[model samples]
Target: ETAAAKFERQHMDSSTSAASSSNYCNQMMKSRNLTKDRCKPVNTFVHESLADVQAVCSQKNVACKNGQTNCYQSYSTMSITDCRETGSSKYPNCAYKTTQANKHIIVACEGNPYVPVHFDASV
Candidate 1:
């Protein structure tokens, strides 16, 4: 998949259910193909359309975690599902805690197309 497509599929979730948010992370990680080989220690699913997310590429420039210029902050407060791996978790049988929140999000962009590529932080 293209970086945009890959990032979107692995990061965005147009769905929501705080009640099932716990199991939500499990199924999400599994279905998104991020639960194979090893557990992804951290993942945050932004609840928004693909367009709103991509628009952030032009919203505001920010320094990335790596101190680069590719990072951008969203103009709007985006709701999200945060799936964090538990210390008790082991490979192949991954487990996570789901923490949902609404806030401005930061992302890393790439390519000449300037697409959002990384889930950086929730600000």
Candidate 2:
């Protein structure tokens, strides 16, 4: 599946965090032995697209507190469990965090079925 489609399926209703994005990107790159600079641009591009996807899904601006361009969705009550295209041969089911911790989140794109990218609570 396409990256945007995969991202939408994984983090449809989660907050976007730069720290989580950086951490996941770095981890994936290291695990795969990818070049840091080469991987960074792609990672940043994907995250930007993800921000757009979240904004569209939520019908809200969802900007970061620092006025960054990225957009994100908030979960005040209902914690997101999973989002994916089920009953598909190519796309496997993806799981997400169901517990909120007042922290931001991201989706790891490198792993199969993807994984939740998390950031600590900090100002």
Candidate 3:
């Protein structure tokens, strides 16, 4: 899948509720097919619609780390979950710390549809 499509499947979770379990990140990471070969060090899941995310591309313009114009930041705060890999986590048994927050997000957009192709940060 394109990074845009993959972004939707991996990070966008509109039909979701707050995760109460400490095991939330591990389960989510596994179910999203990100814990197979190696552990993804960090990831953030946004509780918003795919369309709503795409709209952020037209919000506020931001510069990438190296100063590129492909970046955009959300104007409003959103419900989100951050999954950070645990130090003791092993390959096949990937684990993470689940943190919930509400923040404005920064994303990179590209391609014809100009949708979110990468998640930069949350603030």
Candidate 4:
């Protein structure tokens, strides 16, 4: 799959509305295949269009988690859903807390055409 397609499969939550309930993450993460093998400790779902999100790769430059210099930050705030694992939640019964926010996103780019390769973080 393409970079954008892979990112969408892992982090897109278009079905859930912005006013999602607490169980949003718990349900979405699993349904989206993020919890297939094990619970993902943290994950972010982007609620914007694919084009808008891909544009972030050409925004401001930033350092990635692994100290890469190919990261880019969004120029404007974008709608997103952050899924954080609950402390008491165990492996088989992975539980997460859903939080909606509007913030700038950071992503890593690669390939000959320079497209987003990783969803680094949101600020």
Candidate 5:
């Protein structure tokens, strides 16, 4: 399957929460009338380990470092949130996608900081 297709297949039905994140992000952006430049480019990391859902959950509603931003919350059982630029050294100047080592996650950031970006486990 294609990367985008694979990612969608794995997460689309994982839970309602997973699906909602994308919805929230898209809706928030539309409501705010914000431009894409206000948000960084989408970034995805296929971790050597798929973070435990619980472990990921604990980090929710937390601020990103550099005192710049906070993570958004979602109702899904999977723990994924919208995170802001924390000045992390690895943070990219613009959103970008990667397909490394046969592992990948697709992000639907769509350049909105207030959005609840979606993720998929495909290329």
Candidate 6:
């Protein structure tokens, strides 16, 4: 699948509101296949359209944590859900803290069309 497609399938939650339930991340991460053999420590879900998210790739170039050139930062704030692993949670019973925020997002782009492939962070 394409980068954008993969990103959407893993991180998109268009039907849900920004303010999600406490168990939102836990349920979503598993249902979305983010938690396969292991649990994902952190993840962010964008409550926006695919086109709006993809447009961020052309916003502003930024240095990624790994020093890659494909990273970009969003020019505007967006509604998002941040999932952070709980300290007491274990592998099989992964738990998370769901936080909703409006902030600029950082992403990495790739492919000929150049769309967002990785969600780096939200600032």
Best by TM-score: 3
For every candidate in turn, the CA RMSD to the true structure comes to 1.5, 14.3, 1.1, 1.6, 14.2, 1.3
Candidate 4 accuracy as TM-score: 0.90
- List per-prediction Cα lDDT, in the order shown: 0.86, 0.31, 0.88, 0.85, 0.32, 0.87
Candidate 1 colliding pairs, count: 0
Q: Which should have the higher lDDT, number 3 or number 6? A: 3
On the 0 to 100 scale, the lDDT of residue 41 in model 5 is 33
lDDT of 4 by residue, 63-112 (tens): 99999899999999988999999998788889998889999999998887
Candidate 3 lDDT by residue in tens digits, 54-112: 99999999997768889999999988999999999989889899998889999989988
TM-score of 5: 0.20
Q: Write the per-residue lDDT of candidate 6 for residues 41-74, one digit (tens) a residue.
A: 9999999888888899899999998999889999
TM agreement with the true structure for every prediction: 0.92, 0.24, 0.94, 0.90, 0.20, 0.92
lDDT of 2 by residue, 1-123 (tens): 676554444334334422243235334333333342332222221223344434333422344455543343433212222211223212122212222223233322223433323211111
Clashes of each: 0, 0, 0, 0, 6, 0
In model 4, what lDDT does residue 57 have? 78
What would the per-residue lDDT of candidate 1 be over residues 1-123, giving only the tens digit for each residue? 887888998888876533254688888998998888999999989888888888899988999888988899998898888899999889899998888888899999898888898878889
Model 3, CA-based lDDT: 0.88
Off by over 4 Å in 1: 17-19
Full ranking by TM-score: 3, 6, 1, 4, 2, 5
Candidates arranged by lDDT, highest first: 3, 6, 1, 4, 5, 2
- Regions more than 4 Å wrong, model 4: 1-3, 15-19
Candidate 5 per-residue C-alpha lDDT over 3-78 given as tens digits, one digit per residue, 9 for 90 to 100:
4444333333223233233344333332333224454434232222233321332333533333324332322333
